[PDB]
Amino acid sequence: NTYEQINKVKKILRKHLKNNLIGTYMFGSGVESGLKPNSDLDFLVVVSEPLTDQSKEILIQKIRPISKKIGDKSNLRYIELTIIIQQEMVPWNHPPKQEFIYGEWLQELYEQGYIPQKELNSDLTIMLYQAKRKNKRIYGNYDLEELLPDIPFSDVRRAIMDSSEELIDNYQDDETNSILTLCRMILTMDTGKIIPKDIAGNAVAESSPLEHRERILLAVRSYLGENIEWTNENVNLTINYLNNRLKK
Ligand SMILES: Nc1ncnc2c1ncn2[C@@H]1O[C@H](COP(=O)(O)OP(=O)(O)OP(=O)(O)O)[C@@H](O)[C@H]1O
Ligand SMILES: CN[C@@H]1[C@H](O)[C@H](NC)[C@H]2O[C@@]3(O)C(=O)C[C@@H](C)O[C@H]3O[C@@H]2[C@H]1O
Ligand SMILES: [Mg+2]
Ligand SMILES: [Mg+2]
Ligand code: NA
Numbered sequence: 001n002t003y004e005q006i007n008k009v010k011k012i013l014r015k016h017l018k019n020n021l022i023g024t025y026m027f028g029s030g031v032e033s034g035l036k037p038n039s040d041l042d043f044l045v046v047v048s049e050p051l052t053d054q055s056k057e058i059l060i061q062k063i064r065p066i067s068k069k070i071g072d073k074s075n076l077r078y079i080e081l082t083i084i085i086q087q088e089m090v091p092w093n094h095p096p097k098q099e100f101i102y103g104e105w106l107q108e109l110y111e112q113g114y115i116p117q118k119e120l121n122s123d124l125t126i127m128l129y130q131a132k133r134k135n136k137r138i139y140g141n142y143d144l145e146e147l148l149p150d151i152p153f154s155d156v157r158r159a160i161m162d163s164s165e166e167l168i169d170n171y172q173d174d175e176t177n178s179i180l181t182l183c184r185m186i187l188t189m190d191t192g193k194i195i196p197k198d199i200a201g202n203a204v205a206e207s208s209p210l211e212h213r214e215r216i217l218l219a220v221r222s223y224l225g226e227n228i229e230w231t232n233e234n235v236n237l238t239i240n241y242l243n244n245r246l247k248k
Contacts, residue, residue: 002077005041005066006030009079010138012062013045016055022046022086023140023147027131033196037225040078044131046086046140046147047099056100056115063102070104078104082127086147094155095122095162123166125151125159130194153192160185160246168243175230176222182242183216189246197223204242212238 006026013024028042029035059081067079081102088097098121106114129151135144164185171178180197183204187195195203198220205216215238222228 001075002035002041005077005079006138008066009041009043009063009081012059012066014139016058016062017045017047017051020047020049020051021139022048023142023144024138025131025140025144026136026138027127027134028080029196031136032130032134032194033198035077036198036223038223040080042080042127043082043138044127044135044144045081045083045100046144047083048086050085050118051083051100053115059100060102060110060115064107064110067102067104069107080104082124084124084128089147090149092149092151092155094125094158095120096124096128098124122159122162125155126163126188129153129156129159133194157189160189164243164246168239171235171239175233175235176219176228178239179216179219179235179242180223182239182246186242186246208241208245212241216242 010024013021023046025044025046026042027044029039030041063079063081066076068074068076070078079102081100082098083100085097085099088099098119101116106116128148132145132148132151137143164182167178167181177197180201184195184197184200186204187193187200201216201220201223205213205220208216215233215235218228218233
């Protein structure tokens with residue numbers, strides 16, 4: 001069950017962070033759009049004091065058994081956890097301070113003893129900007145709108161352009177999400193609001209040349225139920241186009 005994992009994630013954070021936990025909120029496809037066949041569960045966690053090396057590994061070990069893994073024919077969904085410190089957000093600075101991350105793309109590192117340390121993250125500005133706009137409080141005495149300062153849209157542009165370089169250099173084995181996120185970056189730069197992946201893809205597609213329109217529309221269907229295979233499509237030509245269109 002999908003509501004079963006969220007209830008399990010709530011218990012792990014509550015009974016291990018204890019009174020250090022201020023609140024737990026979801027953003028992403030859960031609160032805004034609808035969960036598409038291969039969507040994920042995006043959580044934003046706000047705590048009071050920094051976590052220790054031993055406390056971070058506990059989460060990695062406790063979250064692992066209930067999160068889908070890349071390559072599974074499973075009923076579970078990918079669990080994404082991001083932990084921020086409420087005091088480290090004010091005064092607002094870009095990029096903000098990120099305390100912890102749980103990403104299934106980082107799984108082959110979690111197994112080798114990798115423990116994410118306090119690091120800066122421009123992409124977290126985009127995450128926080130859309131989380132503060134709409135989310136689901138699953139635990140906490142407060143709303144996330146009460147725990148964060150108002151994030152200016154100028155820093156969101158900076159986050160888009162800074163986080164763009166990591167995405168374009170890493171589309172391999174993530175072609176469907178890299179194409180759509182670039183489409184979401186192009187719009188957010190020009191329209192302001194955050195758009196679901198399918199709509200943002202369909203919008204930038206019909207605003208693009210035919211050779212790129214078709215590959216974007218091809219990713220819109222993969223984000224939905226379709227089983228697209230990018231083996232002989234050359235996504236590089238399209239992400240370079242979406243890059244230069246975003247770069248301009
Ligand atoms: N313009 C943008 N709009 C939205 N997210 C953006 C944008 N630019 C970069 N991102 C990043 O893309 C990611 C979106 O999260 P995610 O992959 O979970 O998407 P989603 O909306 O939940 O859709 P789904 O989970 O179904 O694929 C975040 O890490 C966010 O910071
Ligand atoms: C913090 N944003 C992450 C980040 O962009 C990940 N890539 C580094 C991205 O990876 C995905 O696209 C994947 O394919 C793996 C999945 C767990 O998360 C998906 O969404 C993941 C995003 O939610
Ligand atoms: Mg999601
Ligand atoms: Mg995702
Ligand atoms: Na994948």
